[PDB]
Symmetry: C3
Subunit: 533 residues, 3 copies
């Protein structure tokens, strides 16, 4: 077998120069395909060209930043020294300019839009003040992250809701998700037959969750999710001055659930401070997961609003966390250790797809069973309250009626008009007590009723509300914050970090409240930036 | 933050006087609501007043018994001494009075009712004699628990089946369960749609199990289940003289399954004797769980009979256990340790609801899969037997035909007439070989056929039987005693108590047989107390 | 209790003579039933008589072989010595006779059948040559097992496909499975109702898997599966000269899955060589399980072909394994330890049935979820390829189109004509990339289209192919070889044998390729033995 030995020797001698050549050939083939498509017709091949251009730009950018990091740092050093020298007097000028800009924006846009937007701004101020008043360490507050997070939220709102480029970009992005969630019908129609629509939720909506979980697992295997997570976390870390671990977890909670996001920094969990753990739990409560995005979109909830709220919930979560539980210790973990994410154990793309598919069984099972139990409990409680109410000639007493008055003030401060505040309060109660699935189902009911166009009032009962109120509710209801989530979060985090069980149990409730407050702040900004139709 | 320190100091100084005042205010509000409802209309508010009165009475009773236990014991001591002094001659008088009462009741009621009731009494005697003959230690029999359990069963039967108060109370109690099992339709119609009735069992009956499991978990969190369990166990312990652990487990098996009832005394399992372990397994085999009560009621089985049999199966189980495996060792565990039940790990009511909902997934999955497999096996076996039978010009051979002759004597001794004994034997075989779900399904078929009113015989084949036979079958079929339950019971108990694996495997079959005998004794009492229509 | 002691003493004294008498009485009763049935009518009772005769013959044979093993070995010794003495010159004569027989069979049958059969023979030769060329140790090849396995495949093909006895026997055997898979409808119609056919796959096909798993568990408890496995493994061990462990696992993979077959030799896994482990994984990839046979038969795939391919895949797997990774070490495990199979933990038949039923939940769940995900991915990929294709005025681009050209040569060498090779290639791609469920679904579509009788071509597109091509595809697609199976096989085997994780991961890909090659060799033999209609 001399030939086999010669082949092995040749492979070992120039292994690097062989795989690199193969990859170069593949890249050349792809580029040839792209250029040929452009030559045959440019307008038809435009998106492929754009994708190729952006990918090339990002690859070159990453290569340059990895290669010339030290030179760039040295080149940026003198400016930082000059700014630090003149800061003691330039800070007042910068702060005054920002305050004047805020005042001018208020006077010339928010006052023009109406009273409800000013009420949204006042509600934002009130929520921040209440978060500060009940803070764990009111005298140890670092105010840089709070202002920077609020400002990042405001900038995102301006870019997405008040400019044609961002509005078009996010409308397109949402429209792509609607097309993408239709592919699960292919499997749903075979496993459950052509009559799979006879049972809409179980046989059409949960398959969307399965498919999205599979796709997310595949993307995590490919390393595309961590690439975006690192960029977002670096932005929030360089602006807000937050710790690398909490920044990474907040950036990852945009796309990942609360029970899986901490796995990004699993090795370093035992050494995190109490403030970082509280921030992790708040970020886990203040966001949703991509797996359940398709279900909410199928209900009828706007995809653009959901994406915008998911993006805006990270800085809000970090700001509310740092204001509700500021850091009094010294962090140990550094940026390099935080930004590395140990990838799963998948040998290829199809194994990752199968692993993502398998993990979705318990998710959908728990969703279905919890929905059944919660709706049965709701029916029983409403019946019991009607039984009690009839003893006072008020058989209309119900859970919705009580929630319409208990949670009304929170909706009013978010900029919802007087009439629709009592209707948003019911959704707030639904989310608080059972989950965000029921609240979004009711919101979809209301949206469909509005779209139909029937009467707004029947027998003195309001049937649907405005579109601005629907948007505010969509922003407010985007979160996994409920009492039931508390225990499972605690158990899973204690499981991941047994040694921190004492600390985990102490901050869970504050993290839940902070997540709620962050969702409400996102809703306040959305309300103050939206006009009245 | 001086204000925060002052508030913390005030909270710490008078923590007891603050929460107590809050609870007092809540109680005052509830009482104000009740009295206002009564004032506005008394007849309409009567049940609320009754519930409040009974709750107040029980609270005061528990407080007094906890406070003045020693004084009451000292006050009762002299009478016990006098009774112990005169017992050596008063025992014969008491026993003769009881025997004379039994003879008079027989002569003047059971003989009037007919022959079948006397046959039921003879069957009870025969079952007790057979249990004694094949006893593990026939010479170590303590006869107090056997007679006391049989007497408690007889008293319960008299109270519930032969008096208007108890009959009305249990009919009302059963009617409340029927109303309560309709609330799961709210969740079933959303998760599975308005067409959830197209698949009756899977999409309407299992949700009832889920909802009942959730409610039971919530009640266990609230501590209401243990309150009733302690009372029942104290009654059976002070009358029958049984050990606290086995009494507690028997009282808990009325509402809880066989695989979860032992958790009430989990810490003390490794130190229980062999007789106590056998009694635990018998009590686990002789009862059902509240989770599956709603399914049987949905089939069409009487709820009152099911509740009565569940209540009556505990003393019967303990008596048959103490007669089939009497105690030859010394018990170690005391009353205080047995009556304390370590509650689960739930921080609030909604977490308990979610935990109860999640645990029901495997239950319903196993139920469905086992039913599928058992029915497929039944079809295959019937086909094979018909194939064999045709070789003798008897293609009618089937599993039902064989069971109608194998188990006929057991039904006859229970007081079922000659004709319907062959039909009850089929249900007995169904329960023995597959489970109690199939037997109750067949019984529901028979009940519906009787209710329709069609011909009782077609082509010489009996279609339905009497209502007394249906009641006897309902009493006899109430149990988790089957060969399949044996292994899972063994595995779970060995799991809970690894050190007792050798002892657990030795008594499981005797416990199963004892559970069957206890169910049959309950059926015998029901048959001897029911009249012929 | 003197009577009890006397009974215990009598039972202990003659325990052996009592159970033996009981068994003798049962056997006498069975024989009396059989003889009475024969007397009443012989033609009607013929199959029962045949079954009894064969069972008696096998029992007597096993008894004699166990009793007189040494005497038979001594009686056979002299002939072996004479053959070993004359072998050095008799081997050439035997080999020449075999080669002449092969040449004569070719010339006088395969050339008569047509060109495609000669192409099948050439493809068999080419696959063997390619397996040898890329062998792990080309210079350590033991050629006895390769030739013996190919010859056993050829003999099985001749017996089953070219003789009336075998053809009738296997047609009858397949027809019995079709009758047997109809019994699950009894359970499926109750759990899911009379409308269970509205969802064909989920509510009719998976119950077949559950029932077959239950039956296989019951048969394993009864010890009937190991009885056949030992016979087949002894045949392959005495002919091919393979190790006992790999022979046993190959014989067991005919009826058992790849994740459960290794349990037959679980204790001895840590001491197996690398070649034996590779052979185990190849045998696990080259066969199917009886649990999923009923689903494929329900789709419309021939049962006789499936059984024949399952039987023929074992020697092919062993030959390809020994040619792709020959043995360079010394085996430690002996025949006695390999042939003993530690049976499960079931106390009776019904416990085994329940255990088999419970284990099927995850199987069906994974099947359904994987099918959903794979079909959604297929739809998305086809849409994306059409999007790309339209940029070159070829919107017909699809996964099927690419596979019809990538895998065409493999189908052509298997003896499929030019036209149908492009259609078999699509099925090959389906099996390779997703699983054998999709490929068999598409094959059932094609078979139904052929059966209908419509036009073979519409608008220049071929709709269905010949029956010989369908048979070849059925033989080729019978296997669990896919990329997704690789990881789960690796994880499960590493789980069973943690100490061999390094060796397990090294041979999995070669085992997968060997399984594919073995399936293709079975297809080549089937094609060369089938005529053109
Ligand atoms: C248009 C709608 C949204 C616009 C969002 C725009 C948000 C940007 C708004 C304002 C940008 C300018 C903010 C500068 C404020 C100083 C913060 C600081 O670090 O010093 C702290 C003052 O901390 C305080 O107590 C100040 C709190 C009162 C200020 C309310 C305004 C004390 O020092 P530190 O502890 O080292 O911190
Ligand atoms: C459009 C209408 C409304 C306007 C929207 C405004 C949106 C602007 C959004 C965000 C900018 C908010 C900056 C908040 C300043 C907090 C003060 C602080 O301690 O941090 C200081 C950083 O130095 C700075 O202050 C940052 C200056 C850059 C401002 C340009 C934007 C010092 O940091 P430290 O020593 O580590 O403490
Ligand atoms: C109306 C239908 C239902 C009515 C139920 C009413 C049930 C109440 C029936 C009868 C109440 C009176 C029972 C008193 C019997 C003595 C039991 C006792 O402890 O002594 C034992 C006699 O043990 C025996 O051997 C006696 C067994 C035969 C008696 C059959 C009657 C020996 O002493 P011990 O070992 O210390 O015990
Ligand atoms: C309605 C028509 C039919 C009648 C139904 C009768 C229903 C009565 C139901 C139950 C009463 C059955 C009592 C069985 C007596 C067993 C004898 C025994 O050893 O225990 C004795 C207890 O002392 C007693 O015997 C209990 C006396 C109270 C009887 C009032 C009821 C001594 O206990 P020990 O020393 O620990 O041994
Ligand atoms: C009809 C269709 C199907 C018919 C199947 C019939 C199959 C039976 C076909 C042929 C039966 C005769 C086979 C005998 C061949 C010798 C094998 C042997 O053990 O010696 C080896 C020769 O190893 C080689 O290199 C020979 C390879 C070329 C031979 C191709 C023919 C070397 O010694 P070894 O290492 O000790 O081994
Ligand atoms: C129908 C038309 C086509 C014909 C189909 C033919 C089907 C025949 C199928 C299978 C027979 C193929 C035998 C392959 C021989 C390999 C050579 C080898 O090394 O093993 C030798 C065994 O001794 C033998 O060679 C076996 C001789 C028996 C042949 C009768 C059949 C020596 O073994 P070793 O010393 O351990 O090395
Ligand atoms: C949730 C995670 C991701 C959802 C975000 C959208 C991801 C896919 C959108 C593209 C889509 O579905 O249309 C496809 C485009 O096909 C492609 O362009 C895919 C190329 C790779 C085909 O549909 P078309 O674009 O209408 O043509
Ligand atoms: O924990 C979760 N992790 C997820 N990852 O995709 C998805 C859902 N959930 C839980 O399910 C509830 C309803 O969605 C939600 O409140 C949340 O607590
Ligand atoms: O073990 C159990 N524990 C339960 N707790 O609620 C409910 C059911 N079961 C098992 O399911 C079978 C059919 O109900 C029954 O025979 C019993 O063995
Ligand atoms: O591993 C398995 N073991 C089985 N035992 O009965 C049955 C199926 N499977 C897997 O399911 C896939 C599709 O059937 C198949 O490719 C195979 O990988
Ligand atoms: Na998240
Ligand atoms: Na019970
Ligand atoms: Na197999």
């Amino acid at each position: 077998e001399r030939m086999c030995g010669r082949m092995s020797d040749f492979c070992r001698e120039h292994k690097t120069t062989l795989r690199y050549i193969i990859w170069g050939i593949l890249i050349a083939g792809y580029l040839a395909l792209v250029i040929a498509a452009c030559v045959m017709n440019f307008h038809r091949a435009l998106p492929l060209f754009v994708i190729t251009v952006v990918a090339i730009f990002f690859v070159v950018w990453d290569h340059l930043m990895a290669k010339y990091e030290s030179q760039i740092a040295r080149f940026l050093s003198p400016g930082q020294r000059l700014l630090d020298s003149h800061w003691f007097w330039l800070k007042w000028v910068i702060w005054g300019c920002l305050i004047l800009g805020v005042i001018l924006w208020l006077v010339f846009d928010t006052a023009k839009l109406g009273q409800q937007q000013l009420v949204s701004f006042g509600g934002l101020i009130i929520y921040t003040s209440l978060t500060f008043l009940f803070s764990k360490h009111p005298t140890k507050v670092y105010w840089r992250p709070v202002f920077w997070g609020i400002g990042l939220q405001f900038l995102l709102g301006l870019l997405i809701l008040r400019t044609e480029p961002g509005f078009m970009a996010f409308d397109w992005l949402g429209k792509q998700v609607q097309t993408f969630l239709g592919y699960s019908d292919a499997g749903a129609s075979f496993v459950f037959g052509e009559k799979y629509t006879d049972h809409f939720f179980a046989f059409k909506v949960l398959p969307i969750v399965i498919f999205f979980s599979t796709v997310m697992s595949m993307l995590y295997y490919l390393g595309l999710m961590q690439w975006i997570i690192r960029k977002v976390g670096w932005v929030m870390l360089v602006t807000m001055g937050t710790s690398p671990v909490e920044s990474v977890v907040a950036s990852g909670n945009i796309f990942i659930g609360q029970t899986e996001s901490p796995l990004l920094v699993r090795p370093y969990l035992p050494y995190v401070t109490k403030s970082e753990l509280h921030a992790i739990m708040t970020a886990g409560f203040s966001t949703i997961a991509g797996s359940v995005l398709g279900a909410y979109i199928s209900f009828g909830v706007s995809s653009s609003h959901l994406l915008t709220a998911s993006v805006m919930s990270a800085p809000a979560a970090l700001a509310i966390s740092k204001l509700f539980w500021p850091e009094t210790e010294t962090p140990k973990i550094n940026l390099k250790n935080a930004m590395k994410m140990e990838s799963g154990d998948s040998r290829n793309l199809l194994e990752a797809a199968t692993q993502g598919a398998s993990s979705s069984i318990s998710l959908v099972a728990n969703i279905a069973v919890n929905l059944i139990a919660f709706l049965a409990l709701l029916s029983f409680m409403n019946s019991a309250l009607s039984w009690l109410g009839n003893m006072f000639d008020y058989p209309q007493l119900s859970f919705e009626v009580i929630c319409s008055y208990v949670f009304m003030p929170f909706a009013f401060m978010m900029g919802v008009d007087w009439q629709d505040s009592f209707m948003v309060a019911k959704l707030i109660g639904y989310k608080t007590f059972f989950n965000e699935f029921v609240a979004y189902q009711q919101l979809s009911k209301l949206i469909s009723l509005r779209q139909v166009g029937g009467p707004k009032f029947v027998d003195g009962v309001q049937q649907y509300m405005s579109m601005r109120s629907e948007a505010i509710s969509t922003y407010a209801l985007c979160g996994f914050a409920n009492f039931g989530s508390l225990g499972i979060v605690i158990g899973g985090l204690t499981s991941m970090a047994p040694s921190r069980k004492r600390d985990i149990t102490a901050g869970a409730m504050r993290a839940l409240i902070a997540g709620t407050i962050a969702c409400f702040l996102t809703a306040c900004i959305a309300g103050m930036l939206t006009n009245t139709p």
